[PDB]
Structure formats: structure tokens, C-alpha cells
């Protein structure tokens, strides 16, 4: 399925609000990379964190071998930076997950072959 278009799902993780901000950063990064590759992106769904960032986002990527180019980014991305959401400015670690799956073709509806059915009347 490397040639097919793909869907990218980003979900915040252990960092909490910092994780949601990191998820927003990852979303911006992947959108910029798609622009650089010339692929077309749209936002199917999004859930924004209340304080900052996004809790989750689903993006559709369309292009030549989009799934092939993006499939290796699936996993959890670890971020280490002085959390802007800590009063003491401590160095916290946040986690965000990117999952890439191909755009499945719509199934052809198959009518029930009448030779596959047994009908009983009683």
C-alpha cells in the first residue's frame, strides 16, 4: 500500500498539557513536511487541549506514495525541554504518538449468490 494516500493521527501522551503542546508542534512539523513534498493535507478531525495545544488530530495526506513516505513515522516521539507550563521552569519530558495508516479502498458490494442460500418455508 506504499503508493496509496494516508491518514496521520497524532495523540498527546504522558506530558499532559506539555504533551498536548508537543502534539501541536508535531502537527505543524508534519504539515510543513507535507507542503515541502507537495502533498495535499486536510484536517478530518481535531480535539484541542483546553489549556494549550491539541489532544488529538486526524489529517488526510494525498500524494504519490504518501503512505510509503509517511509510514516510517509511526511511533511515539519523546520531547525534552523546559516545560513552559511549569512555574519553576523544570526540565520535563513529554510524549506524543503519531500513527500512519493507508487509505483503504471502498469495498465492492457483493449481492448474495442465490446458490449459496437454502430457504425453508414452514
Amino acid at each position: 500500500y506504499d503508493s496509496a494516500d494516508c491518514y496521520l493521527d497524532i495523540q498527546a501522551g504522558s506530558g499532559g498539557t506539555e504533551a498536548q503542546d508537543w502534539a501541536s508542534m508535531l502537527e505543524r512539523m508534519y504539515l510543513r513536511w507535507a507542503e515541502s513534498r507537495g502533498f495535499k493535507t486536510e484536517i478530518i478531525k481535531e480535539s484541542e487541549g483546553e489549556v494549550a495545544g491539541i489532544k488529538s488530530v486526524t489529517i488526510k495526506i494525498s500524494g504519490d506514495y504518501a503512505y510509503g513516505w509517511l509510514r516510517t513515522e509511526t511511533g511515539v516521539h519523546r520531547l525534552v525541554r523546559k516545560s513552559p507550563f511549569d512555574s519553576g521552569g523544570r526540565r520535563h519530558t513529554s510524549f506524543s504518538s503519531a500513527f500512519v495508516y493507508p487509505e483503504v479502498d471502498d469495498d465492492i458490494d457483493i449481492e448474495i449468490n442465490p446458490a449459496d442460500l437454502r430457504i425453508d418455508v414452514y
Binding site: 504522558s14 505543524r28 511511533g75 511515539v76 516521539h77
Partner: protein, 59 residues
């Protein structure tokens, strides 16, 4: 199939990282391939081609 994929998805937490972005040390390292860069700003701006090409070449 979807539920098997959800159970296969590693939890978003400690120890499940495959790409570490440490901004204080100004280092980004991919755990799978070992590719490491210091231009964190470029990578955040979208210079993912190095990591993606490395992963594809590794296969």
C-alpha cells in the same frame, strides 16, 4: 483487525520513544536508525527527509 492494531499500538509513555527531540542539548536522535542532528529548528520546521530516507534505506 482494528482492535488488534489498537492493542499493538505501544502506549504513549516512557520507554516507547523512537525519536528523541532534546532541545536543551540541541540534539535530535532517531532510536531505530541512529541518525542524529543538531538543527532542531530545521527539523521542527519540517526537515524530516533525513530520518525518513534513513528509515526507508534501512527497510
Amino acid at each position: 483487525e482494528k482492535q488488534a492494531m489498537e492493542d499493538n499500538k505501544s502506549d504513549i509513555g516512557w520507554g516507547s520513544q523512537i525519536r528523541s527531540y532534546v532541545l536543551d542539548d540541541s540534539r535530535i536522535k532517531d532510536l531505530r536508525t541512529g541518525v542524529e542532528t543538531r538543527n532542531t529548528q530545521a527539523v521542527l520546521d519540517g526537515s524530516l527527509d533525513q530520518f525518513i530516507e534513513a528509515s526507508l534505506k534501512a527497510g
